[PDB]
Amino acid sequence: CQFELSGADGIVRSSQVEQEEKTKPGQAVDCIWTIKATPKAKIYLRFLDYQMEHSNECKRNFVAVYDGSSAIENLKAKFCSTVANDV
Amino acid sequence: LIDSKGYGVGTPMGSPYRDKITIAILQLQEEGKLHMMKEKWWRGNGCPEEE
Amino acid sequence: LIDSKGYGVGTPMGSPYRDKITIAILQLQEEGKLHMMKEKWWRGNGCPEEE
Amino acid sequence: AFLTVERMESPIDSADDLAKQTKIEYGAVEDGATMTFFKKSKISTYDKMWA
Amino acid sequence: AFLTVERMESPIDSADDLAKQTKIEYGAVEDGATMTFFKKSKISTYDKMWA
Amino acid sequence: IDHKADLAVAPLAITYVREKVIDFSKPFMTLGISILYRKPNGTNPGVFSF
Amino acid sequence: WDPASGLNMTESQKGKPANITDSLSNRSLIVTTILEEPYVLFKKSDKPLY
């Protein structure tokens, strides 16, 4: 369920899966998002709410941010601890 | 209260009486009877001279 | 105050830790570190300028 | 003097004052540990409280 | 009341008097060897500053 | 009881019913139930503030 | 001793090993706490804690 989300600003909706690709919660789920700014512009990411409660260990649930295209080349940050820095 | 420290009922290093005396003290505290004795002896002489 | 309870340290029935741990609790209590330990967490900001 | 250095004081200042007042409408946690004490407490200074 | 409550205001003139005050938020350029002085300090007033 | 653990250092009230089937060390701080209320405003009644 | 393997000397494991434990009473004590508010709360940090 890779989805586009580009422009000047926007809110990656909290658990936006019920309408894009309504998946059963029993199976493991994951959906990626692609962001593009205006021409000649970088991006600042600031979390407004984030709580991966079910563990403080990350083999199951987490959120990650990669720089550039959606490849493994250089992980900007995968964040699992209670708080989440801006990037 | 600047500092805290309690009182007790001393018994030798080995005594099968300590467990039951502890049970009894916790009992009395749950019924609050020792508070009644305290008020009988501290408050009992406590306020006969309300100024 | 109205009543009094006591927060304690559990231990399995008949385990020898009781008599080896109560002494440590008393050592900390009468050695003065316990009050600073309590204050370091209960303190908070304190009393602001309502004066 | 009053408008310069003003010190306001509490209406109620004791546990007993909560009883025989019938205007503050106090409360407690539902059937936690406070209710357990107020139940069966036979000092009767808190039986009005529980009533 | 206005005049004699204003006249006895005390503008801050020292670190400790600042520490007692609360409204004015503190700060420093982080990890520029300045805040670290508060980090590793032992003095009580600087400790509450760092807190 | 089932020995799957050991000394459980956590706020655990030393009450009568537990004491039969556990063992508690000596308390490391005391307790009690008390009132909680809002301290008063200087908002005078204004009926007769004189 | 050999050119290849080296010191195959028999004391590397002594006939009666000194370091033997016949007691399992105190190993990896399993304490137990709870998430009370100002008692035991998750530390506030950004990188994972282990």
Helix C17-31 and helix C33-42, axial crossing angle in degrees, nearest 10: 80
Chain B residue with minimal CA distance to F16? B26
C38 touching chain B per CB within 8 A: no
Residue with tokens 């406590």: B46
Cα gap G30→F8, rounded to integer Å: 8
CA distance B36 to C49: 43
Interface of F with B (CB under 8 A): 14-16, 19, 29-30
Residues facing A4 on adjacent strands: A34
What are the start-end ranges of the E strands in chain F?
A: 9-13, 23-24, 29-30
The owner of tokens 């016949």 is G22
User: Using CA atoms, how far apart are residues A5 and A33, in angstroms rounded to an integer?
Assistant: 6
DSSP-derived 3-state class of residue F29: strand
Neighbours of chain F (3+ CB pairs under 8 A): B, C, D, G
Residue C1's CB is within 10 A of a number of other CB atoms, namely 9
Tell whether D36 lies on the interface with B, counting CB pairs under 8 A: no
CA distance A61 to C8: 37
How many Å apart are CA A59 and CA A57, to the nearest integer? 6
What is the per-residue burial (b if ≥16 Cβ within 10 Å, else e) of A58-80?
A: eeeeeeebeeeeeeeeeeeeebb
Rounded to whole angstroms, the Cα distance separating D13 from F40 reads 12
Neighbours of F7 (CB within 10 A): 19
Rg (CA), chain G: 24
- Residue E47 backbone class (left: φ over 0; alpha: ψ -120 to 50; beta: rest): alpha
SS3 A77: strand
Question: Residue E38 and residue E27: Cα distance in Å, rounded?
Answer: 11
Angle at B25 between CA B23 and CA B29, to 5 degrees: 115
Method of determination? cryo-EM
The Cα B24–Cα B22 span in angstroms is 5
Which helix H or strand E contains C6, and what residues bound it? strand C6-11
Judging contacts by C-beta atoms under 8 Å, the chain G residues touching residue A64 are: none
Please list every residue in chain C whose beta carbon sits closer than 8 Å to the beta carbon of residue F41. Answer: none
Inspect the interface and report whether the beta carbons of B26 and F16 lie closer than 8 Å: yes
Q: Please state, in angstroms and rounded to a whole number, the distance separating the CA atoms of residues G22 and B10.
A: 37
| Residue E4 labelled as part of a binding site | no
| Pairs across C and E, CB distance < 8 A | 7
CB-nearest partner of F35 from D9, D15, D33: D15
Tell me which residue of D43, D18, D17 sits closest to D28, measured CA to CA: D18
Sequence-distant (6+) residues with CB within 8 A of A16 are A3, A31
Asked if A78 and A62 count as a contact pair (C-beta separation under 8 A), the reply is: yes
Count of CA atoms in the C-beta half-sphere (13 A) of E22 = 8
